[PDB]
Paper text:
In prokaryotic organisms, several ubi gene clusters encoding a set of enzymes (UbiA, UbiB, UbiC, UbiD, UbiE, UbiF, UbiG, UbiH, and [name]) produce ubiquinone from its precursor, chorismate. The monomer structure adopts a typical Rossmann-fold topology comprising eight α-helices (residues 19–32, 42–52, 60–71, 89–91, 107–115, 121–132, 147–159, and 177–192) and six β-strands (residues 8–13, 35–40, 78–81, 99–103, 135–140, and 162–165). The crystallographic symmetries of both crystal structures generate spherical dodecamers with dimensions of 105 Å × 93 Å × 95 Å. The monomeric structure of CpsUbiX is stabilized by two different patches of inter-subunit contacts, namely patches 1 and 2, to generate a dodecamer.
Moreover, a [name] mutation resulted in complete loss of FMN binding, allowing us to produce an FMN-free form of CpsUbiX without affecting overall structure of the protein. Here, we confirmed that electron density corresponding to FMN was absent in the crystal structure of the [name] mutant. Val47 is located on the α2 helix, which extends from the β2 strand of the central β-sheet and makes van der Waals interactions with the dimethyl phenyl moiety of isoalloxazine. Therefore, mutating the Val47 to Ser significantly affected this hydrophobic interaction, resulting in the mutant protein having a low affinity toward FMN. FMN-bound CpsUbiX crystallized in the orthorhombic space group (C2221) with 6 monomers in the asymmetric unit, while FMN-free CpsUbiX crystallized in the cubic space group (P23) with one molecule in the asymmetric unit. The phosphate-binding site in FMN-free [name] is occupied by a sulfate ion (SO4 II). On the other hand, the C-terminus is parallel to α7 in FMN-free CpsUbiX and is stabilized by Met199 and Trp202 through hydrophobic and hydrogen bond interactions. Tyr204 is exposed to the bulk solvent in the FMN-free CpsUbiX. In contrast to the FMN-bound CpsUbiX, the structure of the C-terminal region of the FMN-free CpsUbiX extends into a β-sheet region of the core domain with the conformational difference starting at the Glu195 residue. Loss of this interaction in FMN-free CpsUbiX causes the residues His172 to Val174 to be relaxed and the Phe170–Thr176 loop region to drift towards the neighboring molecule. This in turn leads to the formation of a large solvent channel connected to the putative active site in the FMN-free form.
Numbering used by the authors:
A (entry chain A), B (entry chain A), C (entry chain A), D (entry chain A), E (entry chain A), F (entry chain A), ...: 4 to 203
Amino acid sequence: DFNGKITLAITGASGASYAMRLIECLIAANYQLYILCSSAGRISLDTEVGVKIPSSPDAASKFLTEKYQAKDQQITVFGKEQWFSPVASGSSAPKQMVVCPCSTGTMAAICHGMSDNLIERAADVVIKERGQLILMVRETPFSTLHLQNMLSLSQQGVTIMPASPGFYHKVETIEDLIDFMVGRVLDHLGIEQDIMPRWG
Amino acid sequence: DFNGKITLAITGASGASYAMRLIECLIAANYQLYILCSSAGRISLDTEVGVKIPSSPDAASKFLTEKYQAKDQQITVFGKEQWFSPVASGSSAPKQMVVCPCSTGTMAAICHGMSDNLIERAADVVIKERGQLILMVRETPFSTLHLQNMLSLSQQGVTIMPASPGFYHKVETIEDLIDFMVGRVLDHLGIEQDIMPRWG
Amino acid sequence: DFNGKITLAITGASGASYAMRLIECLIAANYQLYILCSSAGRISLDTEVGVKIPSSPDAASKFLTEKYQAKDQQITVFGKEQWFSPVASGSSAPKQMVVCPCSTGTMAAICHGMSDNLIERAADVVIKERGQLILMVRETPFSTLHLQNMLSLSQQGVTIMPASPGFYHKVETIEDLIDFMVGRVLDHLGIEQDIMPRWG
Amino acid sequence: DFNGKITLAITGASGASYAMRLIECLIAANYQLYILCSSAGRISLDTEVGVKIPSSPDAASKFLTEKYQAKDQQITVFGKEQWFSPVASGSSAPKQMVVCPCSTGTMAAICHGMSDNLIERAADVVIKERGQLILMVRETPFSTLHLQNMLSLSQQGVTIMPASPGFYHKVETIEDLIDFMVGRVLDHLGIEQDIMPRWG
Amino acid sequence: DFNGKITLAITGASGASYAMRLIECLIAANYQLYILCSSAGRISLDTEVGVKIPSSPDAASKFLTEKYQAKDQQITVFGKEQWFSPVASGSSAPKQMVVCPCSTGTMAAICHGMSDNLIERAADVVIKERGQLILMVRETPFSTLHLQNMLSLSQQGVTIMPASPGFYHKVETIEDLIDFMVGRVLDHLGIEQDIMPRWG
Amino acid sequence: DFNGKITLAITGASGASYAMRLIECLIAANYQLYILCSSAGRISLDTEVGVKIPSSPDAASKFLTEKYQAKDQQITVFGKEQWFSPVASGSSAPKQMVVCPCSTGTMAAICHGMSDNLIERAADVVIKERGQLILMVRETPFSTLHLQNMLSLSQQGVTIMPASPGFYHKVETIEDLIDFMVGRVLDHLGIEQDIMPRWG
Amino acid sequence: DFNGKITLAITGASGASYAMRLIECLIAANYQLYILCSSAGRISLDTEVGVKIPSSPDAASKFLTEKYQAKDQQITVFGKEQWFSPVASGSSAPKQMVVCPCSTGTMAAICHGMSDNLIERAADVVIKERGQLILMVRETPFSTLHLQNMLSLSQQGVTIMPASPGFYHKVETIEDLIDFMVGRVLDHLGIEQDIMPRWG
Amino acid sequence: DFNGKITLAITGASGASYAMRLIECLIAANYQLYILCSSAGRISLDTEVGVKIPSSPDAASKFLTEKYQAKDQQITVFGKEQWFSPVASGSSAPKQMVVCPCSTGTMAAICHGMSDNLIERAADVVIKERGQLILMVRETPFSTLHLQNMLSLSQQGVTIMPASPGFYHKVETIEDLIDFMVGRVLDHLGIEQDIMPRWG
Amino acid sequence: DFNGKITLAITGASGASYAMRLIECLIAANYQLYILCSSAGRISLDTEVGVKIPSSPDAASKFLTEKYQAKDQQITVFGKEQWFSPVASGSSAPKQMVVCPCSTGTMAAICHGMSDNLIERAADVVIKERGQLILMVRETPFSTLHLQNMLSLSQQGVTIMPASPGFYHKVETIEDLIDFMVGRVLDHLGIEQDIMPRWG
Amino acid sequence: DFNGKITLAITGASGASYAMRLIECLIAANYQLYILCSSAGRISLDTEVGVKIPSSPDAASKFLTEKYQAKDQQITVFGKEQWFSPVASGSSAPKQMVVCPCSTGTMAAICHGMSDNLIERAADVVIKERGQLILMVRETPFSTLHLQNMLSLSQQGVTIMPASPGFYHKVETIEDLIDFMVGRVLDHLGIEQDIMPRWG
């Protein structure tokens, strides 16, 4: 008895911390998560935050389940070519999906409809079902070609959310900046920011 | 005998720290600066970082000169409607200009050619002279209309550089993230990153 | 314990009566209102309907509160440059906003992302959050440039609702025509037309 | 010896009163009128204002002639498929045509060149002769597709005049609002507003 | 008993002399003028040609009336926010308007429909009434964004007339070059060049 | 040992004086010039400024060499169909070319890639090599079709520089206006304005 | 044993003679014809050339069969709403269709995919099967909207063939002008012009 | 004392008879004509109708003057490169110009702004002055590229009038078909069809 | 009794050898050729391969006939302004045309519909008849404007075939590279590569 | 102490010889090279020119170093998924990159921002840093879709340089044709052609 199901995709764009905080807040918000991680996403998590997700999808699910202390079936990891997954079909796919962080190469593939891996096929499905797809892009600067990619998607209802946190405080901390972006994701997903737990 | 002249514009987009670090690095790089600050830019600097720029352009120049310990004529502040300034003419305007941070409302005015204040007129001049204009946008998400604004400018040679720093370290610090963006500005300006001084 | 929060903006386009009836119906529907009025909006209200809104935002809130007999905190007026207001941030801004009536100059500024006053910044925020923005345009004829403005916004999900009431009765009255437009606003906002009170 | 010839088309868009006042003012201005009324236009006139135009074009001409007390040949009604009419040819068609009110379905047909009835063929002719076609649209809101229709026509020189009267008075009356729109039609047609007669 | 009414707007684009000669020729042609001058327009007139227009609209009207020796009511100056002026309404606005000279920032505002001052609202009105608006642009070079602005307006029937006089003589004089542009304005307005008086 | 090589093209657009002053300043700046003159360019030079360029390219080179007192090989004129010239090849063509003045017919041919004479082929070459092409257009008004031509070229990196000099002085002289445009050309070419010699 | 099957549609555009000569030449070329005639097409044939096609499709087939002396099954007329006809299906429809003459209203319907009668559905079918559709337009002038219609179709492979015969002779005759257009149709259909029989 | 001045251009598109009838009707209507004929136009007139226009512009003027019995100065022929002609300047050029007939190659040059001969420069001038240019195109079929050419011009206010006469009679004659097109030209020029003289 | 008729055009783009090999293979394939050569095409043939085509079209036909040993009427050369040629009419023009090699200036003229010489008129004819036009472009790099030219033509069915031979062998020879391109032309023309004769 | 750093990418498009000559000339010009080779690039080098690059990046660097006799660190090969390479970051990536030869599939991926291998990520980086990317395309013909790809990139500043060498000599050799293209690459890179060594 979860409050919703969300697809979470993690790519390699140097914003692993955002992804990890997102998952924590979504677990606390009592949502069911289907988690997809690219090759580069996995390696980013290790390098940036020391989280070593097993490549085996079963052992990966168990791993995140214990990390975050999640409920039975609350977290399921699917593999990069596991095309039988619920996220690959209009029928069983969550109506909300976040790509956090999102590389411009993945964003481009999504823009053009390439569907060369599970992340890209899941996004394609959310778009054809007129669901809610949030791409938390992490790249700078933005070339002309990537703005044309972004513009396309945006016109088609996808939320382009660059990881560009504001500095709203007098002494800013890395936790404020991560939460700035994560609370705005939750805001877009319709989930209350009051459920976000303490960092300490 | 400075190495170059650059126009620096500061708007209110919650990224004051980036602007302050930029100025420091540009002073250290031995460039001449012409500094423009919007109303909201001034108030942002006070709130976010406790820098209280006098509104008087003369007293403002002196103020930043002492703050950063700059050379005679190294820093000159111009006022929001001082249309006689060197930045308002093709003849005397620096060929490089950075807007750091850049609100989307200022970016929109620049995109459409509005020139309603000195920041917008200076940008307009850099664009017609086919100079180098770098807009360090700080906003999220990016609406469709603002991506169309960004795309226009980008197609016209303006560098759209969202303030989206990468997390390249194992324990990230607010100084790494500021420098991530500032070193990339300097990279685009053709200035060596080796001149950036210590934070302590 | 209100049923919702809505932003109401009033510009000068000669349709003050529509705005005044809207507010009445929204108060009766038990919504919380954040009210923005441009310079020309204020002067329009005086000329067209003899409503003299104090320019002071506090005294303006009190004034409308007594006029319409609203609940504590049910009506708050914000000032044209009060950038700290809840409507200027994605986090705290109502997800529904109506501009009633809407000048084409304000509509143009919104279309292009100009954000030169609080009305324009509030609209910009509703659009980037993919909220519901209803512009009740009052202008005729519609130039080519203003149709391109309207078309842009419409494509981006904004409801362009010209103040073009139908004549559905045998003896039409000015109250029928105002309500024609106001009931259609309420229809779009998802509020029941049965709550609209008697004119007498 | 009339001052001009104008084509007047009436569709069903709930603005019959505007059409009836227009005809009165044009008769008083001493113009020759060729009147076209769609099926829905006829039924609108009955419902909204109790004017029962005979479907027979001859008896319809006589009827309006007596209603408005017009001069011999001052008013001629043509039928929905009478393709031999002067309005269906470049040679004999008035150079000014007003569609009052104008449904969006008729406007769409005109935009796309469909010419499926006499109204649409007459408009097509005014457009190819680079005459003056005024469409007094009565619809709200304006969908995206209908703004693209409007924009096309406007770019091609057609005057899109939504029936969106302004409230310029202290106690507005239904007669002021009708005249607001009708005087603006006359303004566009180059006819003096001083000839508009009293309502009483 | 004047031959016509024209709106004349003067902006700051360094072409004050053209404006002053235009007014002289239009007075001599016996037209009624409504004159609008921006802030920068006023300061340009002082600097470039020593004409010090009082900012008070009444004293400004009187001033130009005596300067040029014009007939009662032949010249009326309106103020930058006097929104009750005849030029701000479709009903009473001249069907011909010249902006001489025209800054690109004003041209941009007109292109996008901004209407932030009386000049921009007057232009907006001429465009929606399908009048004749002549923009005598004075700027070089023309950026890409400003050509897109110009192209829009031109497509919408506005005459883009850069102040680019030809050198048609063997010894050219500053008076020949001013008249080159002014006679071409008069040519577009349908006024005879034979009425232009002697410079001496 | 010249400081650079530039291609200079002269067309018939009534701005011969600008061309003649340009050449003088470029000779003084110690650049090597390759000069192209159209049929109408030659006749313009005679009529407007009494410079009678021999049509023979050899005698034309000698002629300008003596006129301006240039160094051996400093000035070479090529003929309208001499397709073996260095300006007709990517390999040997200067990377900077100015068309001064530039007719709209030549500009159109350049925009569309027509290459029907040497001027048009030289421009085509500068554009494909991504060199610097400056078109000093002299025409007014600018039709819609010519703005589309200009816009194309501008988007493709060509500097559209209408001959629209500003009036920056209190008593303007024809020499100030010529230099206004010529100093701005030199500004774009990266050549110091301090080298421009006295007129007397 | 015919050489091919062609669909022939006749609309009302005042070019009945062309249609009648086409049919004659196609019968002589030994093609099988499926003939469609609109309401206005039928009336045009009577008025312009005294050919009174019965509205009954069976009696119409017999009628044309005797007129032109055609072979059993060589000519079959289908009715305006007979949706079971072979021309309404991809499977059984001729791959070549000519609309001769073609009204702009029919052309518009075809351009937009309206399929409101058999002519329009047959054309729609030829286009989706990537067959050969030839529209012999007869209209002048061509409005902007109708050129956009024509351009669309042309881009999509439809042959826009205005009935604009050339005057290639010294004494031109109405028969030369009809044949000019008909021989060019046959040229496009791949049928030899040598089979066209004598007029006398 | 003529009623107007018109520019008439004749190209080679096989419609010489139309041109010759036009001139006759315009002479009878008492207009002043400036006549331009291309190389191919001249040869077309000889071949198609036995009119041998001398290539010398003076002897050509005299020739047409006697042919049509025109008044002193009523007909003046200008030569293909006589750039001093009144039709080559905004100041002295007729505001109405007809190209009859018009080749698609000339139309293309006009569309793109090429101005390679006097016909093309005259058209360019009418377009920049926002005059009335009527192109009586004679070509079939219309390729895609030529419809894009036509569409451009049409959007820019040029009347594309293919030589596609209707068959409005029971026995059509070559004179009816020529007049069909010529009366429609006169209709567009605002000249009464009653002045067209007898053929016999 | 030839197998087909093809139009071959040779321009100056430094690829004369390709043209000469093409002709040889087409003669061997037993096709009838109509050969067009521009001014620059002729000079290219002399310089690059020592083939001196007489400018006289009759002597040129005879010359190529003997060179290649062709059959009576197998090769006919037409002159650059011989407008009576079969290639200038829809009726008699080959349905296949190759421009080998093709300059970008000729390609541009074809793209825009200029038809200023016989090559350009022949191409225009193949395009309007929806024939097969193959442009073997020889230019590098490809500017933006020339890619827009190429893209247009390609979209309109023209085969853009840059002369970019592949290196498919271990020791490549100039004959392999010529044939690479020529066999691909023949492939597109539907002619068997087995008929290509030995080089020796 | 090299003169510059360049990224060289080799794909499979049958132009291996060009790549090998490029490397030689760049080594001789004393530039530092970072070399990327696709799977198909490697196999092309073996087949076409017998160069067997080891797939191991270290052994590949050593191999090319000895082949060309390069200086320590002068040549470094990176592997197809080695994402830590200097070419994958804005900070350390050469500002000049050549893809020689370039397949259309790689070009398409670059156009759309796909970044699926190191070549595509390196190009993406040069484009976002507004560096110099030269694509030496080798393909014929160019489909419509690939011209749209090329056009995009070109508009965004990428140099599309088809491998289309000119035949500038009397007896052409395969070495002349390779150098034609390689000298033009060096020309674009700003490197002197005088440093290119002898083939023998």
